[PDB]
Amino acid sequence: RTLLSLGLLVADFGAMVNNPHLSDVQFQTDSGEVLYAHKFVLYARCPLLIQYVNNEGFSAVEDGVLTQRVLLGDVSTEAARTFLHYLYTADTGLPPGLSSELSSLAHRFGVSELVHLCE
Amino acid sequence: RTLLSLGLLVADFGAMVNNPHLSDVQFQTDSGEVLYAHKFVLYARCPLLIQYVNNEGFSAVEDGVLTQRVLLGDVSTEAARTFLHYLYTADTGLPPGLSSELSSLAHRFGVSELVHLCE
Hints:
The structure is a homodimer.
Chain A: H1 2-14, E1 25-28, E2 34-37, H2 39-45, H3 47-56, E3 58-62, E4 65-71, H4 77-89, H5 99-108, H6 112-118
Parallel strand pairs in A: 1-4
Antiparallel strand pairs in A: 1-2, 3-4
Helix pairs in contact in A: 2-3, 4-5, 5-6
Domain BTB (chains A, B): 23-96
Family (chains A, B): Belongs to the SLX4 family.
Protein name (chains A, B): Structure-specific endonuclease subunit SLX4
């Protein structure tokens, strides 16, 4: 069954969402909350988001280790997290209370399938 | 359709297989060929493989950038690549000419679903 194998893959990557381990990029929302992400995923799945990181980010050093942090304005921490979740897992079961915020994000960062789903 | 979204995710990660971009680990087979990999995936999908990397790897610096290289003995470059492909994409359509080599790898690194498929 490829569905079993795929189901395991989705759970595996889902466990990396907002996971500081191996994180080389951080998004900071308007609340001041930091969300951990991985360039591996951003680059593979969202060329425009990784360019935004490379263009508007700034370096931050914690414990002698350097990371890129990016401000991610005018969006709820919850929407930003759901967006990242979609990139890591392709999960389309997303809370409609967020559909409008997710759609702005998907449009800004060229995630067409997601604009489709957010109607 | 979650299947469309998932199909896109699988193609996206599939394009990272043996892709030097963002690579922080390399496997060297008996032929002397180097395969590029990403700890993000290994850690998310194969705890035993990432431990083997951390335990038996050695550091190599190219262009002032440091990577971990690991010898991956007694296996064909093609099998090693298919193994990595499975970790990145969960693809179960794997060439039976390799099933025996993949099974040794899956068993060594605790990928149970894959031992199942290799019969």
